[PDB]
């Protein structure tokens, strides 16, 4: 089980690096790959098959599925769910 305390603070940190590297901003001044910042992270939380575990461990672990559960956290302003990062 993994908890990300503020995924909205990770987006603010990545926006700072992108603006200092002069990458052209988009909506709410966030970089063009801000969706991919969160999507490539959260796609790793998942349940894998017995065949995946058997292949990864070279046969050492047989008959078990593996999993990673995620609880990301997002702060909103004035309860607005329609903003770009949320």
């Amino acid at each position: 089980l993994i908890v990300y305390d503020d995924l909205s603070k990770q987006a603010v940190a990545y926006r700072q690096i992108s603006l200092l590297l002069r990458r052209p901003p988009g909506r709410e001044a966030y970089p063009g790959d801000v969706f991919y910042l969160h999507s490539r992270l959260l796609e790793r939380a998942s349940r894998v098959s017995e065949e995946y575990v058997e292949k990864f461990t070279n046969g050492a672990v047989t008959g078990k599925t593996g999993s990673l559960t995620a609880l990301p956290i997002i702060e909103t302003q004035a309860g607005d769910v329609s903003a770009f990062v949320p």
Binding site: P24, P25, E28, A29, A78, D80
Partner: protein
């Protein structure tokens, strides 16, 4: 009966105009939040166009 109904009418009208005053306050509060969003977005878009035009010149 007619005079007591008129007293009841003014009392009902007081509650109706109190409710109308309170209902209008909720609409004003929601529009102010939408206005602040538009205020922040206009400043961000103008700055993006000025930085974009000065990178080209």
């Amino acid at each position: 009966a007619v005079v007591e109904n008129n007293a009841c009418e003014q009392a009902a009208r007081m509650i109706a105009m109190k409710n109308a005053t309170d209902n209008a306050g909720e609409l004003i509060s929601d529009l102010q939040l939408i206005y602040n969003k538009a205020r922040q977005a206009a400043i961000t878009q103008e700055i993006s166009e000025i930085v974009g035009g000065a990178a080209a010149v």
